[PDB]
Structure formats: structure tokens, C-alpha cells
Amino acid sequence: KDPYFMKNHLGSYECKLCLTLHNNEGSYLAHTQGKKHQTNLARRVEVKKFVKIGRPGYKVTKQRDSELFQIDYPEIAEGIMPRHRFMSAYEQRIEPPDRRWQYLLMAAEPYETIAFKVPSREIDKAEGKFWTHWNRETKQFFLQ
Amino acid sequence: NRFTVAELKQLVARPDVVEMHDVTAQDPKLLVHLKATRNSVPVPRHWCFKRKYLQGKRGIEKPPFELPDFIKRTGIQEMREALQEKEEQKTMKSKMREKVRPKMGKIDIDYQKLHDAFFKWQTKPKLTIHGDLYYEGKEFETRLKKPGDLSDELRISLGMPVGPNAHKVPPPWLIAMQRYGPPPSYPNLKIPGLNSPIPESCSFGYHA
Amino acid sequence: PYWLYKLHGLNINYNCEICGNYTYRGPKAFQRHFAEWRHAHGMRCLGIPNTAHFANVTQIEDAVSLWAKL
Amino acid sequence: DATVYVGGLDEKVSEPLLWELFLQAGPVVNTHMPKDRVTGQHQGYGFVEFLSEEDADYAIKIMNMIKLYGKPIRVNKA
RNA sequence: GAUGUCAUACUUAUC
């Protein structure tokens, strides 16, 4: 099984390892033994479906600070922290018109997501690890 | 005696036709005048090689034959392939027995279909000009595009369905063209949604 | 190998004064590198555009004279 | 200043396809795609040199949301 | 790519 000897479109034999040609069949088998042929041979989804959704009543309180929202949540009995994220109003269930604002929504696993619309462009940061906290001893979330 | 390439380029009115090998010839001015003529043909590139234009496509794959539509519309190629498949399975005794009592009527497709294919169904091939010469890599250089237009392969690779509506048929980068403005490299370029009507210019670009 | 370098015209020192007096080990290699990005970036510092008339141009003064003559 | 580096492209992308993709924002003078001659495959990066630096900067700043074969293509100044 | 000895194969309606 020689991977270099092939048949051309003229009824001959071609060796692509040394780039040689052979007319008859006796010259292709005799071209493997030699110095040039030897030199050429030597050179070469689960967590989303199991999440319970009961949609309880959230308790969010906003306060205009100057240099902050506080959400009171029940005991979740788990290490999963509620995540906050800022999204646009273009994606909705009914797609209502004149929706060109942004909304910061906080979502948890045993509870529903609470969303607050922000008319301003950029007045704060919606990062989870920058200006957010979640006290598990009192079970209260703070977003600044 | 022999001038350099810079003097031959400055003396001749067309310095683009001057080469490095023409400076050491017997007549640089006559060669510069003959190479920069109107109906002149350049020299082939195989005159300075070392393979005589026949040792390049040694191991490269090549098709055996490219049959046209007029020769393939007569059914002679399938009959020839069937005869070659039937003749390759016969042994020496079957080839020696067919020489004394041969079997007539191998194909017998038609008699006037070939004349109608060569006279009425004749198609003109894709010819070329007399100045366009041939080279070794001329059969593989097929890369030799327009602003405002997109091909089917580029639209399939980028995922942009071309339609009559200007909602998704322009690419989503063109909104950046709504942010910064028109490109300075093409002042006469017209894009739909910014400086062209959306139902009128359905080609997603026009060079006016 | 020495025979493949002697038959193809390699192992010959050539000086190119356009791209900072660089060295080239072949006439065909220098002709291939003349229509390249390095020679174009070297010629763009002097203000000469990348055209076909300055293909065989080596010196900076001859290239400047060819750019001023056109 | 007139050359922009385009990265994040797949191996199935070709040089005429990249030229037709780059010609939508401006005429490119040259396009260099470094590829290995041993395997015959691209490296996923290329350099497009235009006729001016402002057109190359506009093509680099206008190709920040281009997606080819599911992969986002990044354009930077070089 | 060149040299020097052997083999294979082809063309010019050669005899």
C-alpha cells in the first residue's frame, strides 16, 4: 500500500513524494528502491428546566442617593445569589410600541425577577461584582 | 556601454514596460519602443524558466476531458461508457470469439441527431483575445467584486438573506455607516436607508 | 543542498538600497519581494506610490527622479 | 497606517471572499493572508492595505459587528 | 538544473 504512487490522466504512474513519472508498470515498482526515494521517505439546559417558578411578591425600595435599591427576599436555603442585569425593552411578550428604554432586572431561583426601568443613559453600573451585595444573614439584596 | 534600468526608464516614455533583463540587450531603446507599442505582444514567461513549461503539472490532478453540452445531448457518451464497461469484463476467449462472428448494432441511437447537434444545436465556445497569452498557472488563477453588491457564497457565509425589503438585507455593520457617515473612499456610493430610498434601491447599493 | 542553490541562482548577495540597504539571496527572490508589502512600506516613507514603473528601482535617488519625472 | 489587521476568521474563508467582504466599506489596494504552505490552510488572520489611512481606519471602525461562519471578525489598526 | 552507461515509451501515412 503505497500512498504516493497514483495514476495520471494519460495511463501512467506518478510518484508525488519524489515527483517522478513512469510509463510502464515495471518502472513504478522499481522506483521505490533507490537513493532519491529513500531521501524523500527520510525527509518526509438542566438547571433551567428544574428551576421552580411560583412568581411571589417582591419587596423592592428605591432611594435617590448622591456620592441604590434594596430588595427584601425570603430565605432561599441555597448558595445561588440573585443576579442583576440590564436589558433593552425591544424584546417582550407582547412587544408594545414606543419601547426605547433600558431596564435593570434582578432574578433569583425561588423568586421572580423584579425589573426597574431607567430613563437615563448611564447613571450607575449594573455589574454584579462591582456595586452589588447580598446579605444572607438578613437575606437582603442591595444594588448601587 | 549598457545603461541601467533607471536610465532606460527615464529615457523611454513608458517606463512600465521596461524590465531588468532589457537593460543588457543589444538595443535597449528599440526593445523599449517595441515592448510599449499598441498591437505588440509580450514575451512568454517560460523563456527564463528551467522546466520548458512541461514539468509543473506533474503530480497535480487534472480532469481527463470536459465534454460540451452538444456532444453530451446526443447520448453517445453513455453508450460509449456502457460499451467500455461491457468490453472490460470480457476475457481473451470472449474477445477471440467475437472476431469471427461479430454482433452488429452496438449503440444505434440515431442517424440525424448528430447532424442536428453539430449544425442546429452548435454552441460557440468561450474564446479570448490574441493578446491574452497562456501560462502554467493560468488555468489555476481564477480569482481575477463590486461595492454595494454581495455574492451568494458571501451571503451564505455571512448569513445575510438578500431581499427587496431594507430591514435585514443590508448588513448590520451599515448602521455604523449611519453612525459615522458615508465612506470617504467612495463619495458617489449610495446606500439604502441613509441617502437612497428603500423600496427603490433594492440592490443594497448603487455607484452613481 | 549546494546544487539546488547553484542551479536556482541562490546564495548570491544582492543589496537593495530602497528598503534600508537590505540583503537578498536571489534575483527571483528579490523580484518577488519587490512587489510585496515590505518594499511598499519602504517606498511609502519617501512618498512614492506603489506602481509598475518603480518595480526595478533600487536606489532612492533614481526612484525620486522617476517619481518627479512622472 | 493604511493597513488594518483582520482576525477571528475561519479556515474556510478565502482571499477573494475576504476581498469582497472588505470592498463593501472601501476599495482595498492589497490583501495579504499568511498561510502555511505545508498544510495549505489559513491561520485566521490577514492584513488589508487600502489606498489611504482614513479609509482604512473607517473600514476598521465599521467592521466591529461582522460575523463570518458564526465567528465574529475583529478589526484592529496596524 | 547539467554531465556521463542501461531500460521503458512516442512522433513524422519512413522501408
UniProtKB/Swiss-Prot annotation, chain A:
Question: From its record, what is one biological process in GO terms?
Answer: positive regulation of neuron projection development
Specify the residue ranges making up the Matrin-type zinc fingers.
Answer: 13-43
Keyword Oxidoreductase listed: no
Q: Does the keyword Phosphoprotein apply?
A: yes
Residues carrying Phosphoserine:
88
Cysteine-cysteine disulfides = none
GO molecular function terms noted in the UniProt entry? RNA binding; zinc ion binding
What compartments host this protein? Nucleus
Keyword field: Acetylation, Metal-binding, mRNA processing, mRNA splicing, Nucleus, Phosphoprotein, Repeat, Spliceosome, Zinc, Zinc-finger
Q: Extract one GO cellular component term from the record.
A: spliceosomal complex
Q: Could you tell me what this protein does?
A: Component of the 17S U2 SnRNP complex of the spliceosome, a large ribonucleoprotein complex that removes introns from transcribed pre-mRNAs. The 17S U2 SnRNP complex (1) directly participates in early spliceosome assembly and (2) mediates recognition of the intron branch site during pre-mRNA splicing by promoting the selection of the pre-mRNA branch-site adenosine, the nucleophile for the first step of splicing.
The similarity comment for this entry is: Belongs to the SF3A2 family.
Q: State the protein's name.
A: Splicing factor 3A subunit 2
What is the protein's species of origin? Answer: Homo sapiens (Human)
The UniProt gene name for this protein comes to SF3A2
Q: Which residues of the full protein are shown?
A: 42 to 209 of 464
Curated annotation (Swiss-Prot), chain B:
Q: Tell me what effect the entry lists for residue 51 to K.
A: Abolishes interaction with SMN1; Abolishes methylation by PRMT9. Abolishes formation of omega-N monomethylarginine and formation of symmetrical dimethylarginine
Give, from the UniProt record, the effect of changing residue 50 to R.
Moderately diminished formation of omega-N monomethylarginine but greatly reduced formation of symmetrical dimethylarginine. Abolishes formation of omega-N monomethylarginine and formation of symmetrical dimethylarginine
- Tell me the outcome of changing residue 73 to K: Does not affect methylation by PRMT9
Q: Where in the cell is it found?
A: Nucleus; Nucleus speckle
Question: Which disorder does the record name?
Answer: Craniofacial microsomia 1: A form of craniofacial microsomia, a disorder characterized by a spectrum of craniofacial malformations ranging from isolated microtia with or without aural atresia to underdevelopment of the mandible, maxilla, orbit, facial soft tissue, and/or facial nerve. CFM1 is an autosomal dominant form characterized by mandibular hypoplasia, microtia, facial and preauricular skin tags, epibulbar dermoids, and lateral oral clefts. Affected individuals also present skeletal and cardiac abnormalities.
Protein name per Swiss-Prot or TrEMBL: Splicing factor 3B subunit 2
Q: What is the species of this protein? A: Homo sapiens
Q: Which gene name does the record give?
A: SF3B2
Swiss-Prot record, chain C:
Q: Which family does it belong to?
A: Belongs to the SF3A3 family.
Protein name per UniProt: Splicing factor 3A subunit 3
Role played? Component of the 17S U2 SnRNP complex of the spliceosome, a large ribonucleoprotein complex that removes introns from transcribed pre-mRNAs. The 17S U2 SnRNP complex (1) directly participates in early spliceosome assembly and (2) mediates recognition of the intron branch site during pre-mRNA splicing by promoting the selection of the pre-mRNA branch-site adenosine, the nucleophile for the first step of splicing.
Native organism is Homo sapiens (Human)
Q: Signal peptide: which range, if any?
A: none
Quaternary structure, from the entry: Component of the 17S U2 SnRNP complex, a ribonucleoprotein complex that contains small nuclear RNA (snRNA) U2 and a number of specific proteins. Part of the SF3A subcomplex of the 17S U2 SnRNP complex which is composed of three subunits; SF3A3/SAP61, SF3A2/SAP62 and SF3A1/SAP114. SF3A associates with the splicing factor SF3B and a 12S RNA unit to form the mature 17S U2 small nuclear ribonucleoprotein complex (17S U2 snRNP). Identified in the spliceosome 'E' complex, a precursor of the spliceosome 'A' complex. Identified in the spliceosome 'A' and 'B' complexes.
**Which domain of life does the protein's organism represent?**
Eukaryota
ZnF (Matrin-type) intervals: 14-45
> What is the reported tissue distribution?
Ubiquitous.
Its annotated compartments are: Nucleus speckle; Nucleus
Swiss-Prot record, chain D:
Annotated localization: Nucleus
Write down which residues bear the modification named Phosphotyrosine.
45
Q: Ranges for the RRM domain? A: 2-78
The illness linked here is: Acrofacial dysostosis 1, Nager type: A form of acrofacial dysostosis, a group of disorders which are characterized by malformation of the craniofacial skeleton and the limbs. The major facial features of AFD1 include downslanted palpebral fissures, midface retrusion, and micrognathia, the latter of which often requires the placement of a tracheostomy in early childhood. Limb defects typically involve the anterior (radial) elements of the upper limbs and manifest as small or absent thumbs, triphalangeal thumbs, radial hyoplasia or aplasia, and radioulnar synostosis.
State the protein's purpose: Component of the 17S U2 SnRNP complex of the spliceosome, a large ribonucleoprotein complex that removes introns from transcribed pre-mRNAs. The 17S U2 SnRNP complex (1) directly participates in early spliceosome assembly and (2) mediates recognition of the intron branch site during pre-mRNA splicing by promoting the selection of the pre-mRNA branch-site adenosine, the nucleophile for the first step of splicing.
Family in the record: Belongs to the SF3B4 family.
Spell out the protein name for this chain.
Splicing factor 3B subunit 4
Give the organism, scientific name.
Homo sapiens
Q: What is the lineage of its organism?
A: Eukaryota, Metazoa, Chordata, Craniata, Vertebrata
> Which residues of the parent chain are present?
12 to 89 of 424
